Design a binder for this molecule. Sequence first.
Ligand SMILES: [Mg+2]
Ligand SMILES: [Mg+2]
Ligand SMILES: [Mg+2]
Ligand SMILES: [Mg+2]
Ligand SMILES: [Mg+2]
Ligand SMILES: [Mg+2]
Ligand SMILES: [Mg+2]
Ligand SMILES: [Mg+2]
Ligand SMILES: [Mg+2]
Ligand SMILES: [Mg+2]
Ligand SMILES: [Mg+2]
Ligand SMILES: [Mg+2]
Ligand SMILES: [Mg+2]
Lengths: 216, 53, 168, 109, 51, 63, 176
Amino acid sequence: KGKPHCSRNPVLVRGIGRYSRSAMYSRKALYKRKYAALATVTKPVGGGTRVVKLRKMPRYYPTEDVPRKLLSHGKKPFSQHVRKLRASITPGTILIILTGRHRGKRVVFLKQLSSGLLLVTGPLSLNRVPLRRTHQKFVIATSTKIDISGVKIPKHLTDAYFKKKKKYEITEQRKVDQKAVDSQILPKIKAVPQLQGYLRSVFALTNGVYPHKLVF
Amino acid sequence: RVKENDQKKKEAKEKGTWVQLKRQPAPPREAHFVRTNGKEPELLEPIPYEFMA
Amino acid sequence: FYVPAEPKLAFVIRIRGINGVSPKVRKVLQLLRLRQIFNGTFVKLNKASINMLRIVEPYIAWGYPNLKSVNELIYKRGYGKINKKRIALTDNTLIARSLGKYNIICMEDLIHEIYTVGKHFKEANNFLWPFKLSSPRGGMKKKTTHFVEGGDAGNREDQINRLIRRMN
Amino acid sequence: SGRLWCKAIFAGYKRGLRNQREHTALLKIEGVYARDETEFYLGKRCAYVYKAKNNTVTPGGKPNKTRVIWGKVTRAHGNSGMVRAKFRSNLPAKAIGHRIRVMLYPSRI
Amino acid sequence: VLKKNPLKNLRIMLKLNPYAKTMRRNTILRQARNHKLRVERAAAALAAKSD
Amino acid sequence: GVDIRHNKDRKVRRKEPKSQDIYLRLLVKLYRFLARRTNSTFNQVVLKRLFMSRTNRPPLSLS
Amino acid sequence: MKASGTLREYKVVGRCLPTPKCRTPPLYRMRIFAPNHVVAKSRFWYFVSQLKKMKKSSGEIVYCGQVFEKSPLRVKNFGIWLRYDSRSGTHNMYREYRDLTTAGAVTQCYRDMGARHRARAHSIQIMKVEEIAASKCRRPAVKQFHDSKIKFPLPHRVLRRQHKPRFTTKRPNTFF
RNA sequence: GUUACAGCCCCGCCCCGGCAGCAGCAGCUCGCCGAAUCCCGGGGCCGAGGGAGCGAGACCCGUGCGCCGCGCUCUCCCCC
RNA sequence: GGGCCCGGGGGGCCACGCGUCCCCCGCGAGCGCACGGGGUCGGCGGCGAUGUCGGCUACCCACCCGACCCGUCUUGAAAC
RNA sequence: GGCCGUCGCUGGCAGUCGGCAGAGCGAGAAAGAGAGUGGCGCGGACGCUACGCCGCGACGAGUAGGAGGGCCGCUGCGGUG
Ligand SMILES: [Mg+2]
Ligand SMILES: [Mg+2]
Ligand SMILES: [Mg+2]
Ligand SMILES: [Mg+2]
Ligand SMILES: [Mg+2]
Ligand SMILES: [Mg+2]
Ligand SMILES: [Mg+2]
Ligand SMILES: [Mg+2]
Ligand SMILES: [Mg+2]
Ligand SMILES: [Mg+2]
Ligand SMILES: [Mg+2]
Ligand SMILES: [Mg+2]
Ligand SMILES: [Mg+2]
């Protein structure tokens, strides 16, 4: 019985600790921490008491089984993967969603969600784009930012809030959340000159415009 | 070399020092110092051509 | 002036192919265990070895390798001739199981034995299968002439490290 | 309300002089004519759009006659802003000198 | 066994050479310390450009 | 390419008896097991000789 | 030799290895212009085998280091004494260049001997490179740059970068 | 003609005169390198194999993240 | 420089027990992390009953690259 | 790096040894998870046509010619289905 300390030596490089194991032996203080030395349930029957069996043996065996497979190690499921971002996508940046039905719309970034997706809302007043998820890869990042650091994005909306159910009818919670985030963002994009007209516009490549050449 | 190795193997057996008896190819020559004691090295020049024939 | 010791160890890479080779050149190339193009071996130098490398100079490129070249060759292209089979050096138990009778029990013992050419260089080297190196990235200058006359054959002394890194 | 792709020409296949290796395609993206500028397009998804006789299904829409072969810009070719691309089905030689679309969307910005 | 590269994989290297752990722990500490000394000498040189 | 002569890579030594008689093949099934599972070199020689032809196991007279 | 890249200049010294006949053999030094130190040691043994009864296996190289330019920011006048095989006969030349470094002037000499006389690097033996005062120069192409008030336009500036606009609209200017 | 209203070159004495700095982010004035070498990132192609067991013992029949390999916390006690 | 950097008067260490004597000056346990004996997700999105989905191979056509007619005798055959 | 075959290791497996039980023989270091005598719950995949199954390495041009394997093909006979 004890409270857990954190890991003493810092992550110097990935997989390499900053302190060697003698300095770590001294830091843990191991010099003074030496040490030396269901399947059955009885049930009454109205007979006697039977001893019933939990997980009784199977009644059907298929004509052939596959063998078990070996043990790999670094193969985590999706809900335990590490979630990256770019350095160019920061909360407040303006993005260009490229692929969906909102192609080319200049649209405001809110937060990195739990599944890695971008909570992304270029306002429903301007873009006609809701509180919507997008993907990091399928988004170009414009270097045009708002100081959104002082808004209260709600805690209840997360990756399970935007995941599909099964005619899609707009619930009232979508409207209330859209308003409660829209009214917090929209004065900060009105506080910048001509940013709302930039958000109403759509992105288009035109003649002599090459994406390797024009910077944003 | 048979006779000399018999002499070198009977000797240094009671003494116990291990003595090399196989021949060995000519090694790379070991590091050494070269003394330019006083004088500098003489500068060599390609000679110009002159047609003796 | 300090004249350093003449180098005891050479990495020999075969640069020319398998077609149209003289019988004495073919015999010496198969005594150095160079049976493909871009195969490599470590050779210790002495009067016998240097004349064997003189007799096959157009077909080999060789020089005097670095310590880092020994490190990358043993760690990345390092395989062992275990039970007359090419088995990858992925554990020190493999090196110990064959060469432990020479007190060579880890990868570092074998690297020390190859680089600082030891008493048991023959067995640590013959434990190593010939190195299977790729084509030189960037390329060759010219395969057919000597390094001195602007090519790649022959002794390129310290400069074999630029081509080990180019090939390994 | 505009163009969301870049204009590339399917120049030819990856070839030696007397051998062509048609699993790899060669693409000439418009406006890039050096290897310094081709670093943008590597890994971007390329597409050969073409229209045929019979209706085929469209994801998110009604059946049209337009079809595609999707690709991937793999690595730079040559020294002058040419590039290699590798598609799921190898491109027809019907498409030599015709337009393929190099999309922006596998973005690295 | 899949030959993993010891020059890439840190732990295949540590399975083969455990002293590479301290050869690599040193020269992270060494190089960061020398980079601190480089920045500090540059800051003293800029102060001497002021002074 | 590699310069090995593939001339003598196949060793023509006898792997199994050419006879189809079932008792000799049962004795071979017994000594295959004894040859790979004992450390003895008797069983290798006896396994080898149960493969060989009639002219390679000649009759041994009584004397 | 393949006179490749830029030549470097080397101080290669060496000697015959000692016998009990001569206990301490004398050291011989040369100035080798070479791409690298390996071909510089080879070119050393070339000229030493010509001048002495000395081969590589009966001798040794004691020092081989690059000698740098002691003034690489001064434009200087180099006179190079040549020896080259023609198609017919071999010839002696004096020849003048004007570079910052001696290795640069000898690189320029190899390019110019290959240019004018179609002679390749194995024909050419550099025997003497000497930096030369501006009053002692013999060749007029070098002497015309010895003007304190030198002044000239860049008259007909043919433009490069021709394919960056492959298809331009204005014809290019060439007067600048 | 010889410092004058520009400069260049050499020698001697000044601590190799001294202060940077240092094969230079004056991001190219000229090299060889890395046990004297490490970190991070981007693109491409691939994913073959498939009963590796762990702990609990004849005082028990559990369970499949198991070897080698690296090191994390707790079985001491405080402080921020 | 080398001697475990011989010996005496702020950083790092594959260094950690108690006692007896000569000489020199063999069982601690558990729990998570993982560059660790070859890929998985305990992540998803669309379209589908009269006009669409799949079907490499086999039917026809087109394009790019390739490509002379087989047997034979011969040193050599697409051979006038 | 994947797959096909060949060759080699004359490599591995008869150990499917189960309340008549104890699940191992990859491991740098000639040889034993030896036997002795004094001080509740009834369970545990696949396999092995051993002419079979399995695992490692390297290798693969071919005329004339040689040899092997064909669960390639034709016609009749003894058996069998
Ligand atoms: Mg040839
Ligand atoms: Mg390249
Ligand atoms: Mg030739
Ligand atoms: Mg053959
Ligand atoms: Mg044969
Ligand atoms: Mg054609
Ligand atoms: Mg005929
Ligand atoms: Mg005839
Ligand atoms: Mg004829
Ligand atoms: Mg014919
Ligand atoms: Mg004819
Ligand atoms: Mg082959
Ligand atoms: Mg064949």
